Every structure is written in structure tokens, then in C-alpha cells.
Design a protein around this ligand. Structure first.
Ligand SMILES: C[C@@H](O)[C@@H](O)c1cnc2nc(N)[nH]c(=O)c2n1
Ligand SMILES: C[C@@H](O)[C@@H](O)c1cnc2nc(N)[nH]c(=O)c2n1
Ligand SMILES: C[C@@H](O)[C@@H](O)c1cnc2nc(N)[nH]c(=O)c2n1
Ligand SMILES: C[C@@H](O)[C@@H](O)c1cnc2nc(N)[nH]c(=O)c2n1
Ligand SMILES: C[C@@H](O)[C@@H](O)c1cnc2nc(N)[nH]c(=O)c2n1
Ligand SMILES: C[C@@H](O)[C@@H](O)c1cnc2nc(N)[nH]c(=O)c2n1
Ligand SMILES: [Zn+2]
Ligand SMILES: [Zn+2]
Ligand SMILES: [Zn+2]
Ligand SMILES: [Zn+2]
Ligand SMILES: [Zn+2]
Ligand SMILES: [Zn+2]
Lengths: 118, 118, 118, 118, 118, 118
């Protein structure tokens, strides 16, 4: 078994609407978000790879454009943009064009994140 | 499933008591230790998260104050303070208060660590 | 000569109001900003330090709290919140309470920043 | 169960022979490679570890010396030196001298790599 | 005084011609090179910046393309491609187009590097 | 002007003898300490360098061996081993064997350090 992964970062704004009154996350703020796409599958004997890294980047690119330098709450499905909802949403957007996807990781900060799978 | 993780670092001294005579780990020394706490669970449809990262941080804290800026060998159960032993010890202290705990990782140095699960 | 520094991270939203329209920075977005404060001065023979790292952390606190998990455009003096303007703005808030401040570095992203001095 | 891991970096050149003529990986180039060896086993009740980190390092050394500061295409088995092939290859060199080995990870760049377990 | 900086990484092979016979840098190998371009200048009142990060990026591009996924020794002026020689050579390419340039840093590996300032 | 730099890390214990009664630094503890040595001089036309990175690693080794996996307080001159004192102390050990030394930086934690320059 072989797993490949590629990391991306994007700069965005968000706010959490269902947190308690005066919770710091309920104010408009932002992060440099780290996402990791992980894919599992067979290695081709000839090319020596599961899929070209550049090909994983290209598949993620339209989702990436929509996230980077944007305000996440304005994206349908992200109206509650926690790390967990974000990772599921990314899975849902990318799984159909990367059928070998087996994990998506979202880090909001250098110290805290989330991993979504199947 | 969805996993959450939060990272902490604490600064401590320790010594390994059972290593051979010349061994550098037998001398009083210290490290910047890194701990990752991992938990696995259901995402609440309303809050959009498993628990607040800050809840996690708050639960580890009593344990954190005991490790940070201390000499590990003086803590009961850490009298042989390897990473393997520390990881299990941290699991035993934190699992009772975070039942969703699914792994603890401890890194002594930037290049070396271990993961205790179940 | 001896210089000390301490690093801080805060999560915030901002947008640049004087970019041509269509410029990515003109949209509401965010970053995990890193700030480095740098002081220069005489080491006390008794304490062995210039001042305590925690004293530096404490003098920065009221400024830190205005920036962390906030929208920077709403802070007066920050209506054009570029890295350059922000480093100056922080200098200006922090120099009165830390007279040995010799530099302020602001990093918007992991790959890009600014340093302000004197 | 408990898992131990150890990280190494080696500096190397390589080119991919089976990419289309345009492709940038077909040019002679290089990377600071990162490799992680992962072992899973029983923690000895006296030593308090699975095996010494230093032992894992000493076992990887001969493989390490072949990789470091070398051109990978000249190494038998690495004539198509992708991340995937490197992972499996390292697995193959290392599993016989470290039977606890449970994963090998190779990172070609900071944001991209691959995990192998047989 | 304000300084701004921007980091880039590129993947390249090289080798050193003037080291003694068994020296490891004399073998064909590679690295993930890191370069930091630094500029110093006045902050414009309207833009709030010295120049856009993206402008510094665009000026460096023709030079960056020559370096990434290439063999350094084949580039004229880089037949002895040490960090020191690389740093000066980048300065020499970029300085004429970016007169505000005040420093070029190169790092071959995570822990070693060089800074050229004219 | 050209400057070259090399980073090292060592694992050590210390405590601060001159902090008030309850100060956490006054307890026995430890750090992964990072040290950067910086040197400044002329690049030899033939070697393409100031000195070999490995040469600087060799000049620092006897001093490095005294710090790594050791209790700093028992080293003469380090009875009060703050970052400031340690950076001056390392300068003092390293200057006589590296006349081109222009800076020593010491970092105790990931986010706080000291730079001493003569
Ligand atoms: C910035 C941070 O306060 C906010 O983004 C936040 C706070 N707590 C959180 N907690 C969880 N579990 N998930 C999150 O995304 C999350 N997010
Ligand atoms: C500093 C380091 O030598 C010492 O803490 C050390 C050395 N070797 C080790 N080896 C293992 N397996 N686990 C450890 O915690 C460990 N720990
Ligand atoms: C998001 C980022 O592109 C935007 O914040 C941005 C773009 N270019 C920039 N350029 C400079 N010089 N300073 C900035 O703060 C800056 N900031
Ligand atoms: C340099 C880099 O472009 C080249 O080494 C490259 C490109 N795409 C890749 N894609 C995969 N899947 N694996 C690789 O090792 C890989 N390797
Ligand atoms: C990779 C490394 O072994 C080799 O490239 C190397 C070794 N020692 C060096 N020493 C100096 N000063 N500069 C270098 O670029 C340098 N470069
Ligand atoms: C571990 C940390 O609490 C302790 O070593 C500490 C605390 N505050 C400090 N403050 C200064 N200025 N220098 C130090 O070395 C220092 N060192
Ligand atoms: Zn947030
Ligand atoms: Zn140790
Ligand atoms: Zn921005
Ligand atoms: Zn490559
Ligand atoms: Zn090299
Ligand atoms: Zn300390």
C-alpha cells in the first residue's frame, strides 16, 4: 500500500456564527490555512508513480481559487466554516475529481487541525 | 470519521536511568518536548466541531503544568522518562478527562518521537 | 552589543483598500501574522538578562489583544493594513512601553515580510 | 500499541527518465529529501523503549550514505527515482535489518511526498 | 528605515569542482535551495508599501526559471556553485532590475547559508 | 560584504539561580537549544567560499560536546545560564578558534532568543 500527499496553503477570512457570545472565534478574523490532500492507490510500473504531483495540484486548483484570499462564510456549504466542516467540504469538492482521495487535512494554525477521511 | 489534534510544547529536564554507563542519555539533560493530542468523534451538526480546540487545551492543562519547566524523573510514573513511557503516561493522565482521545504523540527533538494509541 | 527577540502569532482579517480592483489583496481575507519584537541593551550582571522574556510578552499584551482574532481595517491607524504599515503601527504602540525596542518584524505569510527599525 | 519514528534528511540529485519531453522532472535536478522510518513494537519493561533511537539510526546509516550527496539514478533499483519508488526501495533495504519497520515516508520537497508500508 | 523580504525555494542539482578529491560536495548532488530577497526603501503613502511582494516576485522570475529544476554548473557564472557564489550571482542578476535590493540570502540546507549584501 | 552561517541544536538542562522565589525558570528544566554561528569575511576566488561549512562544524565541536546532553550550571562560566550569558559564553569559546566569527545567536525555545555580537 502507497499513499501520496500534497500540501497547500491559502490565506482567508472567516467567522464562527454559532459560538458563545464573545467567543474570540465569533469576531471576524483569519488564518493562513494549510491543507493536505492525501491519495491512496497503485503505483504504475512504468511511470513509477500513482499520479503526478502536478496533476494533484491542478485538480485542486479550482477549489483553491475559491478559498484563497477570500472570506469563507460567503461560500455555499461554508456558512459555518470550522476546520471540520472545511475539511469535509474540501473532500466533497475534490473526491469527485480525485477518486483516489483518502484523506483531507485542514490546519488553521501551526498547532491545531483536523483530518477527514471516507 | 474526523480526527482533531492540538499540539503543545513544554520545556523539561530528564535523565534515563537504565541505559549503559557511557550513554549520553544517562546524563542529566533536557529537551523542548512536543506533544500532540489526537481525538476522534462525531461532528455536532450545530456547532460544526467535535469539541472546541480550547476545551482540549483546557483539559490537558493540569497535566501540562506538571511537565512544563520541571524535571521529569521526580514525577511518579516518569521515573524512566523515555518518549514511549511519557506518551503512555500522558495517555493515562488525559484519557479519563478526554474520552475521545485516540492518540498521544511525543517528540523529544525535532527529528524523533513516538505515538501511543489504544 | 546584545539583542533579544521574542515571536508572537495572531490570527486576523484585513484587506488592502488601495490596490487596483481585481487584485487579490483587495478582497477581504486573513493570515496568521507573525510579529518579532527585538530589543537591544545592556545585560544586568545579577539577572544575566536584558529583561525577562515574560516582561516583553507582558508589555506587548494590550497591543496583541487588539490584533488577535480581529479585523485590522477597523483599528484606527490600520485602515491600509499592509505589512509595512503594520510594523510601523506596532512599533508606535510598543516603543513607549518598551524603550529598548530596536526592531519590529511582521510576517503576513511564511514567505514574506517586513522589518521596521528606529 | 506504540510506534516510534525517526527523521533524516539527505541531499541528492535525480531526474525522471519516463516523463514526456516537455516535463521539468526530466531535467537533471535535486532536492533536500526527507525520510522518516517508522517502527511498531513492544516496549521493554526495563529499558522502557522499543529500541534506542541511536540503533535505528545506526541501522539506516549504510543506506543513508548511499543516498546522501549522490545522484539517485546511479543506484541499482533507483533508475526511476520517484518518491514512490524511493519509499519502497528504502523499505526494501531497511526491513531486513529492522524487522519492526512498519512505514517509510519520503518527502521530495517541503510540501509533497509519500508513505509506503509493505 | 523599512526593509521588505520575500522567500523562494527552487530544486536544483549542483556539484563543487574545487574541493579535495574524496570531498562529498564534489559528487553530483542536489538541494532544495532557499533564497531570500531583501529590499530597503521608502514606504509610499498611497500604496502603504515599498513595492508589492508580487512585483518583487515578477522581477525575480526570469532568474528563478533559470535555477529551478536545473543543473547549476551549466549556468555561466555558476561553474563553482557555492552558496557564496550563488548569492553574489543572484545579486548580480537582480540588482540591475531591482535597485532597492539590499540583500540576497541563500540556504542550501535547513541549517546553513549565506548572506550577500553588495 | 559576505556572511555565512551554520545552525546547531543541543539538548541540555539548566536552571536560573537569580530569579524570584516562584519563577518557573528557577526550577530545574531543559530545552532543545538552537545556536547559529555567523562569520564574515572574504570569499577565496579558488574555493568559492569563506570557509567550509564542515570546517566551522569542526571548530565548534569541542564546545558543542560540552553543551550537548549536559547540565549547563556545572559548566564554569555558565553558573547563570540565561540566553544572554550563554551566547556571550559561546562567543568566548569560539572566537579564538574562529577569528571571522561575527555573531552568535542562541534560542531556547522556538519563539525566543538572543543575538550576541561582540
Ligand atoms: C481561530 C479559532 O478560534 C477558530 O477558527 C476556532 C476555534 N475553535 C475551534 N475548534 C474546533 N474544533 N474547530 C475549529 O475550527 C475551531 N476554530
Ligand atoms: C536525548 C535522548 O538521548 C534520550 O532522551 C533518548 C535516547 N534514545 C531513546 N530511544 C528511544 N527508543 N526512546 C527514547 O525516549 C529515547 N530517548
Ligand atoms: C495577501 C497579500 O497579498 C496582501 O496582503 C499583500 C500583497 N502584497 C503586499 N506587498 C507588500 N509590500 N506589503 C504587503 O503587506 C502586501 N500585502
Ligand atoms: C522534481 C519533481 O518535479 C519530480 O521529482 C516529481 C514530479 N512529480 C511527481 N509525482 C509523483 N507522484 N511522484 C514523484 O516523485 C514526483 N516527482
Ligand atoms: C552540500 C554541501 O556539501 C556543499 O554544497 C557545501 C559544503 N560546504 C560549503 N561551505 C561553504 N562555505 N559554502 C558552501 O556552499 C558549501 N557547500
Ligand atoms: C525556560 C525559560 O523560562 C527561562 O530559561 C528563561 C526565562 N526568561 C528569560 N528571559 C531572558 N531575557 N533570558 C532568558 O534566558 C530567559 N530564560
Ligand atoms: Zn478561526
Ligand atoms: Zn533525553
Ligand atoms: Zn493580506
Ligand atoms: Zn525531482
Ligand atoms: Zn551541495
Ligand atoms: Zn530555561
Amino acid at each position: 500500500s502507497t499513499t501520496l500527499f500534497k500540501d497547500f496553503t491559502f490565506e482567508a477570512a472567516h467567522r464562527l456564527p454559532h459560538v458563545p457570545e464573545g467567543h474570540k472565534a465569533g469576531r471576524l478574523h483569519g488564518h493562513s490555512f494549510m491543507v493536505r490532500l492525501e491519495i491512496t492507490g497503485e503505483v504504475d510500473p512504468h511511470t513509477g508513480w500513482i499520479i503526478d504531483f502536478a496533476e494533484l495540484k491542478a485538480a485542486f486548483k479550482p477549489t483553491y481559487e475559491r478559498l484563497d484570499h477570500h472570506y469563507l462564510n460567503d461560500i455555499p456549504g461554508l456558512e459555518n466554516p470550522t476546520s471540520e466542516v472545511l475539511a469535509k467540504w474540501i473532500w466533497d469538492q475534490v473526491k469527485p475529481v480525485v477518486p483516489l482521495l483518502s484523506a483531507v487535512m485542514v490546519k488553521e494554525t501551526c498547532t491545531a487541525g483536523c483530518i477527514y477521511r471516507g
